[PDB]
Design a protein that fits this description.
Keywords: Calcium, Hydrolase, Metal-binding, Zinc. GO terms for molecular function: gluconolactonase activity; metal ion binding. Its EC number is 3.1.1.17. It is built from no helices and 27 strands. The chain is mainly β. About 50% of the residues are buried. The structure holds calcium ion and sodium ion. The site of calcium ion (CA) has 9 residues, from strand 12, strand 21 and strand 25.
């Protein structure tokens, strides 16, 4: 295990660039940061609110889930500025807001996102916590071209990690408080399959007191989910079998991304310790669209 950076203000949304650098978000610092291979930290852009997850899109620009702000805890009314999907230019540092609502519903707490091979964009909504109530979770899909958002999953508990199977016929969403990974068969890109209260299958539910954060998929189809409280990566097979749990040393392990040679290096955000770490992985990661393939 290598420590690539420290003193990160709740790092998240690691994107491992081909040049070896990592572009990630710092939710508390409200910025998009680039960790060079030597370790130098450079601020790509300030992203007010709560930049929560990142993914490289077809235009070489960085797409961002902005949760609107944390307090992490429930934000006060005046530090929450509304959720959104944003785009940051890695050359100019310019920030564009693409979407601040689905239909007429303001986006609440966009969390993480993944592109399909057609440029469609899945993202999760964790929702916001308030004083005496909380939003429900959801999963949305932005149609190819970044044209319009559709609400594909709604009414679960807060959703966090999201990914696609290698063949992209299954979408996975992690439900944070329950430690459950949900699999959604797709009839086609961006459309949950007809037939499945619940709209999917809970293929794995961890026992005890464990919660899920973000995730990354392996070329094997295994889904690697950052696991809160127990502080590990839970590797879950497509059938729901818990294959292993890889300790990381931080109760608040939040995300994982694959890079390096053969995509066999796991870049992991230890958000309790404020660190970005690199960890040799036993198997290769699934190439992400527009980033790795
Ligand atoms: Ca997350
Ligand atoms: Na990830």
């Amino acid at each position: 295990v290598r420590v690539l950076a420290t003193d990160l203000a709740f790092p998240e949304g690691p994107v491992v660039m081909p040049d070896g650098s990592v572009v990630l978000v710092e939710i508390r610092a409200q910025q998009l940061t680039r960790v060079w291979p030597d370790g130098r930290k450079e601020v790509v852009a300030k992203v007010p609110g709560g930049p929560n997850g990142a993914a490289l899109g077809p235009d070489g620009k960085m797409y961002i889930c902005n949760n609107g702000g944390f307090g992490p805890g429930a934000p006060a009314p005046h530090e929450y500025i509304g959720g959104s999907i944003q785009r940051v230019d890695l050359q100019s540092g310019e920030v564009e807001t693409l979407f601040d609502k689905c239909g007429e519903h303001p986006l609440k707490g966009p969390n993480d996102l993944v592109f399909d091979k057609h440029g469609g964009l899945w993202f999760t909504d964790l929702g916001k916590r308030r004083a005496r109530d909380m939003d429900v979770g959801a999963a949305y899909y932005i149609k190819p071209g970044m044209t319009e958002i559709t609400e594909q999953v709604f009414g679960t508990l807060p959703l966090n990690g999201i990914g696609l199977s290698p063949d992209e016929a299954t979408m996975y969403a992690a439900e944070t408080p329950t430690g459950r990974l949900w699999a959604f068969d797709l009839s086609g890109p961006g459309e949950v399959k007809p037939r499945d209260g619940e709209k999917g299958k809970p293929i794995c539910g961890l026992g005890g007191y464990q919660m899920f954060d973000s995730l990354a998929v392996e070329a094997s189809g295994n889904v690697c989910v950052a696991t809160l409280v127990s502080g590990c990566i839970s590797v879950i097979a497509p059938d729901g079998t818990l294959v292993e749990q890889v300790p990381t040393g931080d109760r608040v392990t939040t995300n994982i991304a694959f890079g390096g040679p053969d995509l066999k290096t796991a870049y992991i955000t230890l958000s309790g310790k404020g660190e970005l770490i690199a960890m040799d992985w036993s198997r290769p990661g699934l190439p992400l669209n527009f980033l790795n393939k």
